[PDB]
Amino acid sequence: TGYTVGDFMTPRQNLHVVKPSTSVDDALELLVEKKVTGLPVIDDNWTLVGVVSDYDLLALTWKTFNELQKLISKTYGKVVGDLMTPSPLVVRDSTNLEDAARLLLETKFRRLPVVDADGKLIGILTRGNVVRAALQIKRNA
Amino acid sequence: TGYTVGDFMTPRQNLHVVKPSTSVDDALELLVEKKVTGLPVIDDNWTLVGVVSDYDLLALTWKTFNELQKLISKTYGKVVGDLMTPSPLVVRDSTNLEDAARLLLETKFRRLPVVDADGKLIGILTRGNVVRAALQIKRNA
DSSP: OOOBHHHHSEEGGGOOOBOTTSBHHHHHHHHHHHTOSEEEEEOTTOBEEEEEEHHHHTOOOOOSHHHHHHHHHTTTTOBHHHHSEESOOOBOTTSBHHHHHHHHTTSTTOEEEEEOTTOBEEEEEEHHHHHHHHHHHHSOO | OOOBHHHHSEEGGGOOOBOTTSBHHHHHHHHHHHTOSEEEEEOTTOBEEEEEEHHHHTOOOOOSHHHHHHHHHTTTTOBHHHHSEESOOOBOTTSBHHHHHHHHTTSTTOEEEEEOTTOBEEEEEEHHHHHHHHHHHHHTO
């Protein structure tokens, strides 16, 4: 009963992923290039293994450009695996939308990777996706 | 001396703008489609008149889908103008990057519209832009 995550999630094709081996610098570049603040982390086979955020990659956040440069300088040789959150909360495409919506707010990541039965990353549910759903629904008898 | 906003700001062509007359619903749609949480508000001549965020449009922080639907239901007939923050902090393209970076953190909007001498919106400086700058600087020594 009711809509499901799969109805409104961000499709795999619009995901921005990194791996535990991705250098912090490259993850940061991806964040700024794709204009997102967090990234799902997969392994070589697209198994979802974690999530990582700007607040992980730039931990001690920064309050001045100088402090930021200091952080950027110390990223060399570091890798996503060291800073990521493993085993994050996930949902399935069949997950009830209202349940998923609740969960979004219970994870610091504020997004829910969507996985299939094999634990492969197939999408992500963002707060924006949930708002889009509420909007689309209003738009109907 | 040093880098300036103009060197790293988001170009006009990549802005997502609304007007004070934009319906709340359309602004919400634009937010979710462009995957941003805030929007500069311009008038018909691209004069920057304000800024508006998801937290403004959905005030009337939702914590469940049902609460969200309640909010979405009450957006009808409302416009951005009522909910926006007028006369926001802005910078110029010539603004010193370190100064601008500091300011980003002093505005709840967490972005700085960039205007020209006529007060026209010509870009925006985001935290992501500033991180991009620190990265680019490091790369070149």
